[PDB]
Every structure is written in C-alpha cells, then in structure tokens.
C-alpha cells in the first residue's frame, strides 16, 4: 500500500525578545537511518519581515511555505502593497492549514517577526491550523529534549531566589539577543549529543526592526 | 496507488570544481529476475542537463516522454529557444518536482527516486533529488536506493561539504564514481556489471559514456574460503 | 437515546419519553424532551443515534408545518406516518442513513379515533394499540399483553403505564432519569407535569 | 482538558485549563480554551483544537452577518444552530468537537447551549467537558446555587478546574475565568494552577492529603 | 551499530563504535561493544544489546570451563559452534548478531554469526545498521596480505563511514588486535573525533534556589551497639 | 496498554566530587487518574541506592526480590553489598524473565565503601547495562531529564551544587510529562552520610 | 533398571558414629601428604607427586588444581574422587556465583559450595 | 541460489554459486555452499542458511558416528538421514538439499531432498531459486556417462545462465568433483564464466 | 461488579460498595454483599469479572482464617494487605489472571490506627486516606480532596460519604442500587443497616 | 501459458501452446493465443483473457481506422497503443502482451509490454507462466538472422521445454509466420515437438 507520507525529522525553535524574534532550525535533512542533505534550509524569509519553517515531513512543509509565500505576493497585488502584519499572516496560514483538514499536511509550523507595536512574536500551529501566539516554541524531532530546558532558563520555572525557601520565585528579567543566541546554541549542542537526527548545522534567522539576519553554526556530524 | 513491476536500482552522482558526474547501471528487473539487460535510465536534456531515474521502469518511460515534450514546447514561438531561453537543469527539475508532488496528492504516485545533474547558465552546478513522495533535497554527493547507503559513504569522502568541490578535479570524481558503482555491483543483488556514466562540464559540455563495465574486481580470495566455520576440505 | 413508549386507549394516545441524555461516561442532561409535534393533534416521539434523531424530527415537523399552512389543512395520522415512512426507508439506502426510530401518536378528528404508528430506522410501519422501540417491549410487553384493553380511559392507561416504568426501573441496568409523558386526544397534545 | 459553563443569577461563569497534550508529552501550559467569538457570545474549546478553533471564529463571522443583515443582536439559540447545523454536515468526516455556546441575551437572558461533533445540541444549566469532567462536576454539584454571588460563583468555577487539574493528568497549566453580562463578557484573569493549588489548600484547608 | 573484523599478516583486528540507542534517543555515548569471550577470543555484538552481552557472557563461561576441563587454550571454532547451536534452539528470539574473532592453537579466525544461528566465514566482514557504509569502505580498500598497521587503519576507517554516515552509530572507535603469539590488545577508544564543544553559558544555580519541604537524616548504618 | 506508561513516574541519577545524587517523582497513578502522590521510587539496601520507574506492580515485586536477595548475600558474604556488584544482581535477575520480562526502568546508585568511587548505573527493562559517568535517566519522561542533564550537568560538583542542579532536571522534566509530578525526592549520597530532601512542586 | 538405592548408604552406628565418614577419613590417612600455609603476603600449599610407574608421564597429573584465577586446590586421598570434585567446584563457581554477581566467589563462598557436595554425599541416596 | 549435482562416467560432481542475500543486499558473495557431510559424501544447501547449516551438522555427526561402528555409509545411507531430519521436522524447517556421494560398489549418485522432506534419485539434480530459469537447457543438454571435463562444462554453463537471471544467485561458481582419485575443489571467475 | 468505595477517619474504615449484579440485559440482584470478612478486624471488599472476584475473596479468606488458627494470633492489615498483593502480583501472569480489584480496611490493635490499601488486579499496592476503583474515583475524589480531615468522626466520615454516593446517583449511567456501608474499628466489624 | 516471438533474415515468426487453464483444469486445450491486430501486426497474448482480448479488439479498431485515415501503421505504432491502453489502465488489468509486425522499411520488430505497460524492443522475446523455464535455452541458442527452417525449430525447440515444465502451458504449438511474402499459419501436434 502507497503511503503519502514520510519523516525528514529535524528540529526547529522559535523564541520572541522584547524588541526581536528569532527563528532557527537544524540543517540536517533525513529518511530513516540516512542522511540526505547536511545543509538544507528549513527556515525561510517570506518577505514582510516574517521568518518560517514547516518541520516535520518536507514535501509538505516545501509545499506549505511556497503557498505562503505566493500569498503574501497576492496580498500586496490585492491591498495596495500591504504589509502583511504577523497576526493577519498567522490566521492567513490557519486558513491554509485546515483547507486540507482531511489530507493534512503532516508539519508543524512555527513563524516569527515583529508585531505592530513592534514587539517580538512568535506563532505555531498544529498541522491542521490550530495556532497560538507564544514566547517560547521548539518543534520536530528533539522538540521534548529542548522545551523543558528553556521553560528552566527563559522561564525560570522552579527558579526561586535563595534565601525565601520558594516563598520569592526568581524575577522574570528580559533577555538580549546576544543571551538568546546562547540559549539557543545550547539547546541544539545538547540535542545533537542525545538525538540522532539532529546535526551538521544550525542556521538561525534574527528578525529586527532593522530586517532579517542570519546566523549558521557547525554542529556535530555523526 | 500501485506497486513497482519492472524496476532500476541506484542512481549515484557528484559535485566537482567545473561541473556534475552522474551514473546508473543498464538492468531492467523483474522481481528477482535479471529481465532486460540494455536500459538506459540516464536521460539527457539539451546539452545542459541529465535527468538519472530509478524505481518502475514504465513510469520511467511516461517521464522520459514528458521530458521529451518539454523540449518541444519551449521552442515553440521562442527565438532564443537554443540561446538565452534554453531549458535550465533548474526549470527541468522543479517540473518534475512539481508533477511528482501532485501526483502523490492525488495517491497516484510516479514510483521512482530522480537525480537531475547539470549546469547552469552562470556556470553553477545543479545537483537535486526528487521522489515518488515529492521530496526534495540538495547534497554535494546524491545517490537513489542502495546507493544512498553504500556510495554516498564512498563519495563523502572526496566532497565532504561544499569547500571540497573547488578542490575536487573530474578526474578524481569519476574515479571516485566508478568505484562506487563496483562496489555496489559486488553488493546489490539487483545490479549489473554494465552502466552508463555522463559528465556535464561548464568548460567541455556534456560527455555521454555508455556501454561501460565495472572492471578490476576482486575475486581471487574466495578460492581459500571453505565452508562456514569447521570444514577444512 | 433510550426508552419510548406507546400505548393507545380508549379516547387518547399516549407517550412516554426518557429524560435521561448520556454522553458516555457522564450524565449531561435528565429533563430532555424526546418529542416533537407535528401538527395540533398529532405527536412523535423519537430515539436513536445522537443529532440524527433531533435533525430528523425537526426535519418532519418543518415538512408537517409546511403542509398545514399551503393547505390550511391538517393530515391525518395516517398520512403522516405514511410520509415518515418513506422518509425513512428513502434513507436507509442513502450515503449516510439517519439511525432514527419514532412512535407517532395522533388523534384523527374525522374519524374520532386514537392512533399508534411504530416505526423503526429502516421504515417498517406498523399501527398499534402498545408500543416500543429498543429494549424497552421486552421489559414492558409481557405487562401490556395482561393488563390492556381497547376501552381503557386515559388514567387507567396513564396506571398501566406506572406500572411499566416501575419494571423497567426495577431490571433496566440504566438509569433513564424517568420519563415525561404527554397525552394525545380530541383537545390536542399536553403534557403530565407530575409522574 | 477541563472546561466547564454555568448559568446563575448573575449570567453565567466560564471556566477552563490551560493544557494541550499529545500522548504523554506535555505540549502546552497556556492554551486559550475559551474563544471569544465576539463581545457577547463565549465558546470553549474540547475535543479538536483546530476543529473548535477555526469553526468558532468562523460562527462569530456568520453572527457578525446576521446582524448586519438584520439589525439585531443574534440569540443565543440561533448561534449555536448555525455551528450544529454545520458540523452536522460533516458528520461522518471526523470533525471532533465539545463546546458551550455561552451568551446574554434580553429576550433569553443567560443561556448556554452544548454543541457536539455527533450533532448534538443542549440546552442547559451546568455543562462540563473534557477529560476531568468527572471530576469538576463533583464541586459543581455540590455547591451549585441559582443565588450565587457573582464572586462566589467566579470561584466556584475556578475551583471546579482546579479539582479536575490536581487529579486528571490531561488537566492543568492554569484557569482562566470569563463572566458572561448581557452588555457582554468579563474578563477574570489568568490563575496558574501551581499558585493556585498551594494558596487554596491553605486558605479553604482542602487538599489534606498533599503535604505542603 | 557498526562493526567490523578485518584479517591480517598473523592475525585479526575487530573494531566497533560506541552509540547505543533507544529509538531515536541515544542512551549511552560511550557504549563498550567489544566483548571477550576469553583472553584471547573477543566478538562485537549487534542488535538486542541484552542478548549479545548475555550470549558472550554465557558462552565465554562455558569456554572457560571446557578450556579446564581440557587442559587446552581455547578455539574460536568451539565459541562459534556453542553460540550458533545457542541460537538456532531459540529461533532467532535471542537477537544477538555478533563478528567473532580471535587466535588459538590452529591459527587466527574470523567468523559472524546471524541470529538465527546461521554463520559464515571471511577476510572482511561487518555487522550492525551501519554495515553497508562499513562494507563500502572495506570493498574499496581492501587487499590479500594486509599488514597489522593496515589492518588496524582500514578497520577504523570502516568504523568511521558507519559513525558519521549511518544515524544509528556514532561517538567513538574501539579496537581490538589479536596477534598470533602475542597478549589480545583491547584499545578502548582508540578513536575520538566526537568530543562535545564547550557550552555557551554555565548552568550551575546559586544554592537555595530549590524549593524544599523536609530534610532528614537517612540511616545506611546497621544496628548500633549499646 | 503499553505497560511501561500506566502508572507513570521518573528517576534520575547523578555523579558529583566524592558524591552521588538520585531522585524520582512520587506520582502513581492509573493512565488519566492521579491515585497516589506518596509512591516513592527509590530504595536502598545498605548503602547501594536503587530507583525503578515503570510498571507499579513490578516496582514494588522487584523491591522486595532485592531486599530479599541482598539479604541473603549479606548474611553470606559477612558484608554489605557494593554498586559494581548489585549492579550485575539487577541485570542477572531481569534477564532470567527474558520472554516474560519484568516492565521496569532501573536505576543504581552509590559510592564503593573501599575505593570511594562514586557509581551510577542505568538498565532497560531485560537487564543490558548502561554505565555512564555522567548521569543516568528512567521513566516516562526519559526524554525531558535527557534534554534537562544534557544542558545541566557539569562534572565534579560539590554535594550541594549537585542537589540544586538533579533538583532543577527533575522538575522540569516533571512538569512537561502529564504521568509524572505530585511530588518529588532527592538524595544526597557521601561516604558515610546520605541526606533525603523532598521538593516543593505544582500538584496539577 | 533405574537407581533402586533411593535410601541412606551412610547410617548413625548405636555408638554415635557414622561409619563410612570415619572410613572414607581412614582412606585419607593412606593418602600423600599434602600441607598448607599461610603468609602475611601469600599463601602456598604443596603435596609430593607419588609416581605410580616412572614410566608414567606426572606432569599430566595435576595433583594441585586452578579452581578460579584467585583460588587453588590440593588434596590427599583417593585422586579420582578429587579429579571429580574439582570439575564440580570449577563448575559451581560460576554457576552458583559468575553467573549471578559478575565475579568470582570469595574463597570461604566457594569452600562452602565443595563442602555442601561434600555433606549430600554423606546423606543422599 | 543455484545449486546442481551431475553424475558422469568416472563418479560426481557437486555444482553451486557463492551468493547469499538478505533481501537485495548481498551479506555474503564467496559462500561456499558445498559442504562435507563424509570423505565423499557432500551436499549442497538451498533455504534458510540457519536451517541446512543446522541440519548438515547434525547428518555429520551422525554419519561420524555411524562410520565408527559399521564403517564407510552408503550415499543412500546419508540421503536417508537428511530425509529423517527434514520431514519429521517439515513444519519448522526450510532446506532444500541435494545430496551427492561416490561409492566404488555404486559409484557416482544423486539424490534431491526438496522441501516436504520427499526423497528422490535421480542421474543429475537441480535445485535452489536460479534453477527454475535452467530447467529447459539442462534437460536438452545432459547425457549420462559424460565425461569430466564434459561435465564440468555442463555444470559451468548451466550455473552460468542461472546466475545470469536470478539475482539471488551470483559471485564464483565452485564445483567439487567426487570420483575414486579423491576430492577435487574447482573455482571458477566471473570473467570466465559470464563470456561463455 | 461496579462502585466501591473506601474512607479511612480517625478511628475507623467505613467501606461501601454497590449492591447491583446485572448479568448483561437484565439486574439479577440489588442485595448482594460485595465483601469478605478475613479476621475480626479486617474486611475486604472486592469488584471485577465475574465468578472471580467471590472465588478469590473467599480464597484470601480461607488462607488468612487458616493462619489466624495456626498461630491463635490476627495478622496486621499490613500484613494481610502484603499478602494480597503478592497474591495477585502472582496471578497476573498466570495462564489465566484473576480479574479482581480490592480494598482492605482494617484496624490495627497494637498501633491503635485504622488503615485502608487500595490494591489493583495486577497487584498495584497503595495506603491511602480514601480510596476506590473502577470509575468511582473520577466522580468522588473531588468532593474527597476538598472535604477529608484526617480528624474527621466516624459519623462525619458517613455524612462524606453520603455525597459521594449522591454525586454517583447523579452522574452515573448505570442504576447501582445503592451501597451496603461497613465499618471497621477497635470493636471489629459492623454493618450500618440504614443507608 | 507459453508464448514467444522472434525475428530472423526474413521477418518474424510468432508462437504459443494452446493450454487455457482455470486452476487445475484445463478449459480450452486448443486455444489460439496468437490474436491479429492487423493484416501483418500479430500479437501473443498472456495473464488475464478477458482483459488481453479485451486490449486487442480495442488495438484493431483503433488500427483499423489508423488505416483509413494514414494507410498501413508500423508495428512501433501498434505496440504504442497496446501500451498506452496497458499504462494508463495498469490498476485494472492483468495483461503481458509480445506485439511482433513486418513492414517493408523496418522488417520483423519485436516488441514486449510487460505488466506494468513498458515498452521493450527486442531481437526476441518471451512471455507467460512457462517462459521461466527456457530462459538459459533460449539465451543459449538464439542467433540474429536465422533461416525460416531455423527459426521455426528454434521455437518448436523452446516452446518445447516451456510445455515440458510448465503445467500451465500444453496442447498443440501454434505458429505464425510474418514476411514479404505474406501470413503463413503452422501447428505442430504432441506427438511431434514431444520426442524433440
Ligand atoms: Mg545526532
Ligand atoms: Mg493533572
Ligand atoms: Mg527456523
Ligand atoms: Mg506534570
Ligand atoms: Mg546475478
Ligand atoms: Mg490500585
């Protein structure tokens, strides 16, 4: 029997600063106990300063992003050159997503940017369009060895200050882009060492109000 | 939805300083029979461009005619159809990634892994995968079915990343590419000692190779295996 | 849902309706009104897969209602029974059948006379003095083949039917939540309020 | 999940978890349970998030139609037909769905109307939904009043949740609490459960079994 | 898993990663593939981990013992013979796949041997879900009359095409070099090329930064005197 | 019905200078429902440490099979077991019931009373050890506490940096696993005294 | 066929004595010294190796026997009853032992283990 | 698998390819798959390794033993031991095997063991996937009292096409030839072989 | 069978459980008596397959009457329980499992403690305050964490229980016919005969 | 079934068995398997009846009006539509059709379309259950450019073996001869080919 669809694992996080947003993402690319590709992007500039990535099975995910990125094309060409704000490009992507509620594509989707007020954002969808705005989103293979890690030290979760014995909890201070950086490296560092799909290379997409940045660092290759 | 009758086995290719090598062996099977033994599944596009197909030989054929088709319909009402509107290796890949995508959309997949190998027009080399699922991915080293496991491994370790394909030389690249295709002769049980092997340089063009074997092989040492552990006669 | 019951006397017709709506492990509802009127003198009352069974009745009554105005006119029992009928067994060959069965209870005002329908999913119709859909004729019918005659008046009916509720709370492994009742005669349709 | 909705006095007390899990991973703490299909009318989300999700954004669009088209606040009963009529189309198809239609209106006042992917649709008082409904509908029960203070009822339904997040482990994250008017709804903040529990168990004396 | 055996000159080398994995989760980094069934005799393990440590352990007991009883080293045909009778009783439940190897009296040998009991014979051979990227390298490089310095070099490089290539290896080379004549040398981690980079950031909490309910004393000792 | 996640639960072992650390939930429960918030984990016989997550049933049969035979060893031996050793009694014993297996995640813990060394040690469910130096995860959120001491862990803390960095991996492996939680203890295990903590944590 | 001496073959005599015991220590007394001692650093035991024909090669009897890599056994009396003993000891040492722990028995485990055959054939049928 | 043994003049001779798969990976391509049960009684193996290795080991120790008592078996002897093993043991075994041997009273014989556990004589058998595609040519090309080197050509060139077609056959044709001289291992090339 | 229930309060263990048997379609029995005494100060209550669950009470029973008289010495409920669970832990990989769920409450005489263990079919051992099995729990424990005081009365424990067997009535399905309510304290075993 | 065609100096020569089997029993024993699409495009037919006689009758009618329409179609074009019919219906039929065809320009062609619906030129070709048995016969002895007389026992030869074997294949052999000199029918009975 056909099955329409596969697993190219991978790993993607999404994390929302004050002022800044970034996207990044494994650039190992899989199918079973193969590798395919040691560098195939996964994150992506859709223009607009909205940064996406579809991880999960990558047909689909390619597909998703192609739709959304010729949306924001249709968009500009229907509304007077737009700009696509991130909330109206979330619902837009819902949309897409549960146009094929009964042949769904198998990803979990996660996009970045600025709000109008200028505020870092972070959105993730399920893969038939549910969707949420979040601070803090891992997704694919490693997502369950990350997520807890950053509820520790983005969060301060279980962080009390010494001294009260838990009556004070530590106090929510913000982060740089410098300080997420770290936090993200270490995330993958540590996912490469316990998660054999994850690898090779980390490429990482920093949204500012100033545009879209990128950063790629090597990650281990067995 | 279907299931795969007369099938080819891996297609294996490269990256080098000034261009692309791909490769596939001549044996159409048939289950575990060895039944046509004079295929080509290498498929060249224009002078720019080689399509390597694996997988159902019928389907094969269907795409092999769409390919054909394409050619035609680019000089229709195109002056510079054999100029600056030639078909690229990347207009002829995302077509075909295009139609096998679509195709396991509607649960009729086209049963085969595809390589398209070329050069551009600005001198670039084209190296992409395709599948029966619509996956795609770019490597300096690709291969299809057996290959993938046995002589990616083989040609990593010519190309390990992209810093490596400037210092890699066509003449060490196919080396590396003949070896892989003996080894896999020696291995896949649905392989043959024939093959066909092209080379898309952006200097000296495409060069098509058939009728080539696999040579050189090691078989002396079998003589002195005996049995499977105690016999010594 | 679960237990309907209908028994036709002398002068009246009458229902008894569950109020109990189960959603699997818990309880929701024990006040539900498993019924609908079709027309002044004419009741159905109905069980079956959830959703179904309401969007079917509403469907009927909307027809019924429908009828009624184009013709200022209203159908007998008979003839909305016969309707139901062929709505039903048009349905059961349908993509997706409604897992409905009703009990029709209707007052024919030419002819003075109650009237019983039973009806099932697949639409097998039969006019009866006493009826019942699921398991609740193998608890009650033994009492109703005894007890019944054709020249009861209502509150000996309403009795015989006590007495049927009370078995069925007795060795019913369900608790149905008792039942609302509503009696069907030359006056029109109106409701028991304590039972 | 947890989600619960209650009709008193006042109007009616929205109550929900914050939690989404796939399996046993803990995929979210801060899901939005409650959508807000306009300034009105509340819908709870059980079941399918996407189904619950993009279906109740979808009923505010056709209630936003409806009285534009007919110069009228929508009933509450009109409303959830509109969302059972159309799930009731997809029956079959594998819609999941458990939601309570909440709203305020002059000639309703405070109704509540269960709405489900079978194509069922209930009016009633007190409805619970998810995995530890058993468990809210317990306080509720117990407790339940029509002459209930609009603070007490507030915490009657953060309370319900918070029985239901301590036992079933599908339950949890934090409460949100809405308090459905009939010039609208109110919001009442965001409770994490881990706060929550401790300051209740020490406050009401519950809880004697955990050690704190 | 990969693992290879490789003959040579006066002997035979074994070599094997040191990834052991629970589906997609590695387990143990440092995982010791390399089992000695005696002094001399040492086999690598594929498949059910369990087993394979069981068998060897097992099997080597059993050597031990008849290498007593005879007075006599022990051969590597006997531990082959005792682990493929073994394993075909079981019908294949047993999911040890292992690469025997080692030196006797009779000579240096080279065996594998499939889970369901089924064994071969070989100058080269490898096992595990990196073997095809393992068997490339040994197809492409190996030769008749191969030095120990050779032998040890084309074993690792097998080894490293499964670590890097094959998901389901990784970390590190271990070797083993049984001579004729000579003591087995066992090489643990003879290979590195896997060592983490240093983190970014410590993570060390300052000290009350856990929540604590109750603190007591627990009692290891046994009954006190008076 | 897979038998390794009905009742849930976790534990984690740890190495440090001159000291180990383990530590495990207290949740037991039945899929959904939460029934217990006082099942301990971990046991020790003498100063070996030994936590099991998995199957409840076979936790507590397992338990009293090792009190049993640690007993017997003793009384035999004139001595207190050591880690190296029980370690291999663990993995003897599960691999006895290899096609009826006990389901179970083990986790030793301790310090060798002659060379001091300290020792952790990890085995699944048929009794294949795992003995790393750095640390040793089990249960239904194996995934989470390998994601959590992979980032954590450093080697050669002192005791009571130790306690707040196991502490730390626990709760937060805790907290994103629906079968794990109510509760959690944490031992820290020197030469010659061994201190149990119980943590502070969200009952949900 | 099938072993019909199911009862005791050593019995208490009405003196208190157990016959074959004492008998079996008289064969012992025949038997070639062997001694034993211990050092601070070491132990050493030690036993003549009594040639029956110089014909006979003695290096093939093993008079003193490796029973694990830290245990060794010396003996006097009946040779064939030793050869067999020391095959059960090697034996139960790892099944017994190995097999459970991981390591070889201490030395007062595994004399425990000799001694306990010892005893069952002293009351077994 | 392709495996053959042809009878000739002078005694007989056991034919077989060296490959063995797992799937369409090649684990083994030099298997020597003519294996010694006696001096001059050998067999060749089709069907799951575990099972013919199994089984070949226990007609050898048995056929060993026998040989300790009563003297030199017959092949019919060795056959009748193969058969015992495998159809009392039908349910739970796949071998297919063709046994061979060199007496001086019966000289060269052959006799087949497919899967039921049937036994049949025959002057030449075949057997093993590769043999389905041969049946045509080695039926129109076998003569009885060949000669040696007749009859090895016979065998290398009926191999020869079974390899050609079935890819679960492939590597070195080996041969070993049974006649009152001795025992004589033959090892043919695939440069030889494919050209014929 | 169905609802068991368990609380244990200062000074006693009040144990209640259902009185209905139903044998698929119809309620056989709504007086059956779904527990064993096993020593003067020990009672266990029992609930799953049936034919089972009696067969293994009274085997429990029979083995802990035998120790009391070989001894003339009652086992602590610790003890009993212990033994219990090893029992089941036993059965569930025999050739064919006992399918039985059981509470113990007994009343300690040397500790002076009343205590209840809650123990499963596969031998899932756990002391607890309260406790249940089947689906009782979903519905009880929540109206048990908000109203339980280890100083509770034993009439105050009755009244908690009361509410628990009235949240049941309410939300449950199936029609239990109520429970038969036991208590175990320092005087031994007595049944509350108005309930 | 066994069914073949091969090319040679003068044309093409078509043959087949005449055994049409449901299960064990033989419903037809004088089938005629070699079906005319056109004056001289043959075609053998194999798998299921229904379907390859269904394929066939559409191939005439399609040819039929090719011929009406642009005159005479070359035996490429006859196999281009028996596979776009087979392609393009692959999840429906059950089809393994051998089209062989002279033209004056291009001769004797043979083409085989397997079950998938691919194409293949081949100098011969063979098809059908019993084809697995000659293919080392007919590997062995096929020569390019035979004789008639050649030709027609190189097949009687083959189908032969194939009937031999194949208890799927029997009854009578059918030929048809295609050249310039026009359509020859041949039939050769058991008693014949038997003996060979
Ligand atoms: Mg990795
Ligand atoms: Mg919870
Ligand atoms: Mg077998
Ligand atoms: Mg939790
Ligand atoms: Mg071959
Ligand atoms: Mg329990």
Redesign the pocket.
């Given at each position: 029997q056909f099955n329409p669809y596969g697993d190219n694992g991978g790993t993607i996080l999404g994390i929302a600063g004050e002022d800044f947003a970034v996207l990044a993402g494994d650039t190992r690319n899989i199918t079973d106990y193969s590798i395919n590709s040691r560098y195939e992007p996964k994150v992506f500039d859709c223009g607009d300063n909205i940064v996406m990535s579809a991880n999960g099975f990558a047909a689909d995910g390619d597909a998703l992003v192609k739709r959304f990125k010729n949306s924001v094309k249709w968009y500009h060409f229907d509304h007077n050159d737009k700009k696509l704000s991130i909330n109206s490009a979330a619902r837009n992507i819902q949309h897409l997503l549960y146009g094929k509620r009964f042949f769904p594509y198998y990803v979990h989707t996660i996009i970045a940017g600025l709000d109008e007020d200028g505020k870092g954002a972070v959105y993730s969808f399920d893969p038939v369009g549910s969707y949420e705005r979040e601070q803090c989103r891992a997704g694919g293979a490693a997502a369950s060895l990350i997520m807890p890690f950053l509820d520790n030290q983005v969060n301060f979760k279980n962080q009390y200050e010494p001294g009260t014995n838990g009556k004070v909890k530590k106090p929510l201070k913000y982060l740089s882009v410098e300080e997420v950086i770290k936090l993200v490296r270490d995330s993958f560092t540590s996912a490469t060492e316990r998660h054999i799909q994850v690898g090779d290379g980390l490429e990482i997409l920093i949204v500012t109000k100033d545009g879209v940045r990128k950063e790629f660092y090597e990650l281990k290759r067995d | 939805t279907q299931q795969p009758i007369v099938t080819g086995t891996s297609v294996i290719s490269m990256k080098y300083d000034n261009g692309v090598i791909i490769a596939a062996d001549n044996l159409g099977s048939y289950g575990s029979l060895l039944r046509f033994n004079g295929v080509e599944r290498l498929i060249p596009v224009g002078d720019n461009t080689v399509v390597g197909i694996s997988g159902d030989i019928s389907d094969m054929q269907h795409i092999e005619r769409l390919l054909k088709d394409l050619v035609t319909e680019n000089a229709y009402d195109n002056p510079l159809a054999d100029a600056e509107e030639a078909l690229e290796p990347s207009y002829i890949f995302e077509y075909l990634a295009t139609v096998m995508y679509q195709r396991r959309s509607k649960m009729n997949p086209l049963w085969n892994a595809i390589i398209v190998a070329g050069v551009q027009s600005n001198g670039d080399q084209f190296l992409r995968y395709v599948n029966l699922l619509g996956v795609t991915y770019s490597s300096p080293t690709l291969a299809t079915g057996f290959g993938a496991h046995m002589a990616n491994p083989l040609l990593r370790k010519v190309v390990d990343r992209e810093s490596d394909i400037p210092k890699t030389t066509v003449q060490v690249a196919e080396e590396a590419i003949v070896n892989a295709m003996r080894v896999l002769y020696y291995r896949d049980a649905r392989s043959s000692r024939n093959f066909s092997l092209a080379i898309i340089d952006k200097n000296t063009g495409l060069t098509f190779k058939k009728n080539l074997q696999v040579e050189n092989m090691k078989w002396d040492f079998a003589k002195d295996i005996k049995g499977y552990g105690t016999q010594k006669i | 849902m679960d237990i309907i019951l209908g028994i036709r006397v002398q002068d009246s017709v009458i229902l008894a309706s569950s109020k109990a709506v189960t959603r699997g492990i818990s309880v929701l509802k024990d006040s539900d009104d498993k019924t609908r009127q079709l027309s002044p003198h004419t009741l159905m009352s109905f069980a079956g897969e959830a959703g179904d069974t309401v969007q079917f009745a509403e469907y009927i009554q909307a027809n019924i209602q429908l009828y009624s105005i184009r013709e200022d006119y209203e159908l007998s029992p008979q003839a909305v029974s016969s309707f139901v009928r062929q709505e039903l067994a048009k349905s059961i060959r349908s993509r997706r059948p409604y897992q409905v069965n009703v009990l029709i209870g209707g007052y024919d005002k030419k002819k003075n006379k109650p009237e019983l329908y039973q009806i099932d999913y697949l639409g097998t119709k039969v006019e009866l003095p006493y009826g019942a859909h699921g398991y609740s004729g193998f608890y009650t019918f033994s009492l109703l083949d005894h007890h019944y005659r054709p020249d009861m008046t209502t509150e000996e009916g309403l009795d015989l039917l006590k007495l049927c509720v009370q078995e069925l709370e007795k060795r019913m492994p369900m608790d149905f939540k008792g039942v609302i009742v509503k009696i069907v005669d030359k006056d029109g349709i109106r409701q028991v309020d304590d039972f | 999940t947890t989600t619960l909705a209650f009709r008193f006095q006042g109007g009616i007390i929205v109550a929900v978890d914050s939690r989404a899990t796939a399996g046993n991973w803990?995929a979210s703490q801060t899901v939005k349970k409650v959508i807000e299909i306009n300034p009105f009318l509340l819908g709870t989300m059980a079941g399918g998030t996407a189904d619950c999700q993009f279906w109740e954004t979808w009923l505010g669009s056709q209630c936003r139609l409806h009285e534009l088209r007919e110069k009228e606040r929508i009933s509450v009963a009109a409303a959830s037909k509109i969302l059972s009529n159309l799930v009731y189309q997809y029956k079959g198809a594998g819609l999941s769905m458990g939601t309570m239609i909440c709203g305020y209106t002059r000639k309703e006042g405070p109704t509540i109307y269960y709405v489900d992917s079978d194509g069922t649709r209930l009016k009633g008082d007190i409805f619970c939904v998810g995995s530890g409904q058993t468990f809210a509908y317990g306080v509720l029960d117990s407790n339940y009043k029509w002459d209930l203070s609009v603070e007490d009822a507030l915490y009657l339904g953060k309370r319900s949740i918070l029985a239901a997040a301590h036992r079933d482990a599908y339950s949890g994250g934090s409460v949100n609490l809405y308090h459905v008017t009939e010039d609208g709804w109110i919001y009442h903040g965001n409770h994490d459960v881990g706060e929550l529990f401790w300051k209740v168990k020490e406050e009401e004396g519950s809880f004697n079994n955990v050690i704190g | 898993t990969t693992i290879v055996g490789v003959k040579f000159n006066n002997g035979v080398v074994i070599a094997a990663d040191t990834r052991s994995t629970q589906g997609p989760i590695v387990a143990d980094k440092n995982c010791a593939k390399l089992h000695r069934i005696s002094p001399k005799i040492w086999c690598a393990g594929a498949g059910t981990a369990a087993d394979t440590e069981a068998v060897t352990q097992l099997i080597g007991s059993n050597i031990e013992l008849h290498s007593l009883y005879t007075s006599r080293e022990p051969r590597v045909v006997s531990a082959l013979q005792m682990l493929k009778q073994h394993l075909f009783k079981y019908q294949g439940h047993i999911g040890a796949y292992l690469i025997v190897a080692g030196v006797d009296p009779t000579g240096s040998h080279l065996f594998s041997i499939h889970a369901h009991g089924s064994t071969d014979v070989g100058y080269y051979l490898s096992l595990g879900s990196g073997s095809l990227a393992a068997m490339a390298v040994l197809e492409s490089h190996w030769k008749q009359d191969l030095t120990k310095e050779e032998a040890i070099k084309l074993a690792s490089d097998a080894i490293q095409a499964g670590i890097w290539n094959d998901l389901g290896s990784g970390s590190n080379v271990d070797v083993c070099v049984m001579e004729i004549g000579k003591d087995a040398e066992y090489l643990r981690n003879y290979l590195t090329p896997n060592v983490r980079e240093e983190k970014q950031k410590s993570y060390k909490f300052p000290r009350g930064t856990t929540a604590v309910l109750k603190e007591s004393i627990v009692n290891i000792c046994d009954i006190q005197e008076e | 019905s897979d038998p390794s996640s009905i009742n849930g639960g976790i534990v984690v072992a740890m190495t440090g200078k001159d000291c180990v650390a383990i530590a495990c939930d207290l949740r037991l429960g039945s899929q959904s429902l939460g029934v217990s918030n006082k099942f301990e984990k971990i046991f020790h016989y003498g100063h070996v440490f030994l936590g099991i997550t998995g199957l409840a049933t076979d936790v507590t049969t397992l338990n009293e099979m090792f009190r049993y035979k640690t007993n017997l060893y003793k009384l035999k031996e004139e001595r207190a077991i050591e880690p190296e050793t029980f370690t291999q009694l663990v993995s003897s014993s599960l691999y006895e019931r290899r096609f009826g297996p006990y389901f179970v995640g083990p986790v030793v813990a301790g310090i060798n009373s002659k060379s001091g060394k300290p020792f952790i040690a990890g085995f699944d469910l048929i009794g294949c050890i795992d003995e790393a130096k750095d640390f040793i995860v089990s249960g239904t959120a194996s995934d989470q506490l390998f994601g959590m001491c992979e980032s954590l862990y450093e080697p050669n803390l002192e005791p009571e940096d130790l306690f707040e960095t196991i502490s730390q991996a626990l709760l937060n492996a805790?907290?994103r696993?629906?079968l794990?939680?109510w509760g959690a203890v944490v031992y820290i295990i020197k030469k010659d005294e061994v201190v149990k903590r119980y943590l502070k944590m969200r009952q949900? | 066929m099938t072993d019909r001496y199911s009862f005791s073959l050593t019995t208490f005599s009405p003196s208190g004595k157990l016959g074959q015991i004492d008998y079996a220590l008289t064969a012992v007394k025949q038997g070639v010294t062997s001694l034993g001692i211990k050092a601070t650093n070491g132990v050493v035991i030690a036993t003549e190796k009594k040639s029956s024909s110089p014909l006979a090669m003695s290096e093939t009897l093993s008079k003193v026997s490796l029973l694990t890599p830290d245990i060794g056994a010396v003996y006097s009396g009946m040779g064939p009853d030793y050869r067999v003993l020391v095959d059960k000891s090697r034996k139960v040492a790892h099944t017994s032992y190995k097999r459970i722990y991981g390591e070889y028995p201490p030395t007062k485990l595994l004399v425990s283990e000799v001694a306990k055959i010892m005893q069952e054939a002293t009351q077994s049928g | 698998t392709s495996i053959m043994a042809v009878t000739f003049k002078d005694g007989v001779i056991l034919g077989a390819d060296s490959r063995t798969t797992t799937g369409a990976y090649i684990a083994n391509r030099v298997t020597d798959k003519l294996t010694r049960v006696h001096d001059k009684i050998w067999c060749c193996r089709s069907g799951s390794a575990a099972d013919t290795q199994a089984i070949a080991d226990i007609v050898q120790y048995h056929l060993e033993l026998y040989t300790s008592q009563y003297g030199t078996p017959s092949t019919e002897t060795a056959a009748s031991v193969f058969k015992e093993l495998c159809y009392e043991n039908k349910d739970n075994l796949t071998a297919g095997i063709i046994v061979a041997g060199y007496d001086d009273k019966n000289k060269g014989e052959v006799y087949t063991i497919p899967l039921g556990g049937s036994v049949h004589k025959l002057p030449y058998a075949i057997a093993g996937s590769g043999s389905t595609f041969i049946y045509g040519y080695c039926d129109k090309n076998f003569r009885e009292n060949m000669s040696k080197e007749e009859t090895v050509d016979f065998i290398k060139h009926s191999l020869s096409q079974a390899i050609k077609w079935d890819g679960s056959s492939g590597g070195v044709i080996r041969m070993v030839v049974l006649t009152a001289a001795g025992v004589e291992r033959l090892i043919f090339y695939p440069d030889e072989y494919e050209q014929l």
């Open positions: - | - | - | 803990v | - | 805790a907290d696993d629906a794990s939680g949900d | - | -």
